[PDB]
C-alpha cells in the first residue's frame, strides 16, 4: 500500500445521531454495543493477521532442481559458519551473530568492527577497521549456487456500503424529526427563519439568469436595464483599470 490513505468517492461510515429521545428508541445503545464489538473483533483479527508472519566427452546436465533453497558455501565461509550448505539468510544471520558474540563493534564507532583472523581470511582483506555495510556486501560475493551433475570420462465491501447508505437514511429521518420538533416547541422564530431563508435562497438561485447564449447576444441587458443596474455601471471602473 501507499504511505497515505487512498481518497475514494463513496462515503465510509457516516455518524449515528445522538439527539433522538431514548424514552422512545432505547436501541441506539444496543447498535452502539454491536459497533464497538465489531471494532474489538476487527482489532483482534488485524493483530493476528500482522503477527502470523511475525576424444573423450563429459556429461553436463542442468537438472530440474536447480533451486536456491540450499545454496553452496565457499569453504572459508563454511568453516566460519559450520554448516555445509544451508541458505543465504541463515548465512547472514550466522555471520552477524558471530560478530555480535566476539564484541567487535565498540566497547562510525558501531559501524567499524575489529577485524580478526578468520574474518579477514574469509574476506581476503587486511584492514583493522572496516564498516559492516561492506562486510555484508561481501556475503553476496562469497556465495555460489549449487553445482549440477558433472560426469567426466468482495461481498463485504457491498455489505458495508449498504450499512453506510442505511445510516445516511437514518440521519435523514432524524433531521426531519428534529425540524418538526423544534417547530413544535417554539414556532414563531422558525417560521420567520423560513420566510427569510427561503427568500434568500430564491434570490441566490435567481442570481444567474442573464448569462445565457441568446440572452447576451441580444440587446436586453445593456440598453434600458437601469432597473438591473448591476453591469454597465462597471464601465467607469473597468476602463480605468485598462482591461477595456
Amino acid at each position: 500500500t501507499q504511505t497515505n490513505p487512498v481518497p475514494v468517492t463513496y462515503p465510509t461510515d457516516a455518524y449515528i445521531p445522538t439527539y433522538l429521545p431514548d424514552d422512545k428508541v432505547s436501541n441506539l445503545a444496543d447498535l452502539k454495543k454491536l459497533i464497538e464489538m465489531d471494532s474489538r473483533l476487527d482489532l483482534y483479527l488485524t493483530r493476528r493477521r500482522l503477527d502470523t508472519s511475525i576424444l573423450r566427452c563429459s556429461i553436463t546436465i542442468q537438472l530440474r532442481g536447480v533451486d536456491g533453497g540450499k545454496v553452496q558455501y565457499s569453504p572459508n565461509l563454511a568453516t566460519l559458519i559450520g554448516m555445509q550448505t544451508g541458505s543465504v539468510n541463515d548465512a547472514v544471520y550466522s555471520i552477524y551473530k558471530y560478530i555480535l558474540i566476539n564484541n567487535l563493534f565498540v566497547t562510525p564507532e558501531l559501524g567499524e568492527v575489529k577485524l580478526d583472523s578468520l574474518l579477514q581470511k574469509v574476506l581476503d582483506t587486511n584492514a583493522a577497521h572496516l564498516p559492516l555495510m561492506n562486510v555484508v556486501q561481501t556475503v553476496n560475493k562469497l556465495v555460489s549456487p549449487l553445482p549440477p551433475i558433472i560426469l567426466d570420462y468482495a461481498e463485504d465491501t457491498a455489505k458495508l456500503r449498504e450499512i453506510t447508505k442505511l445510516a445516511l437514511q437514518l440521519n435523514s429521518s432524524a433531521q426531519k424529526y428534529q425540524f418538526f420538533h423544534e417547530l413544535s416547541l417554539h414556532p414563531r422564530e422558525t417560521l420567520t427563519h423560513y420566510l427569510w431563508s427561503s427568500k434568500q435562497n430564491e434570490l441566490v438561485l435567481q442570481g444567474d439568469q442573464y448569462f445565457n447564449e441568446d440572452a447576451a447576444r441580444t440587446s436586453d441587458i445593456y440598453s434600458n436595464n437601469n432597473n438591473d443596474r448591476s453591469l454597465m455601471g462597471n464601465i467607469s471602473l473597468l476602463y480605468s483599470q485598462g482591461r477595456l
Binding site: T79, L80, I81, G82, M83, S94, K97, Y98, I101, L118
Partner: peptide, 30 residues
C-alpha cells in the same frame, strides 16, 4: 512454546560457533 524453542535453538547455535572456535585449536597443532 515459542519461547522454549528459541531459548534452546540459540544455545545450539552458540554451541555450533564454539565448536568451530575449538576446531581452530585442532588445526594449529598440525
Amino acid at each position: 512454546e515459542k519461547l522454549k524453542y528459541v531459548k534452546e535453538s540459540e544455545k545450539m547455535l552458540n554451541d555450533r560457533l564454539s565448536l568451530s572456535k575449538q576446531i581452530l585449536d585442532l588445526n594449529k597443532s598440525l
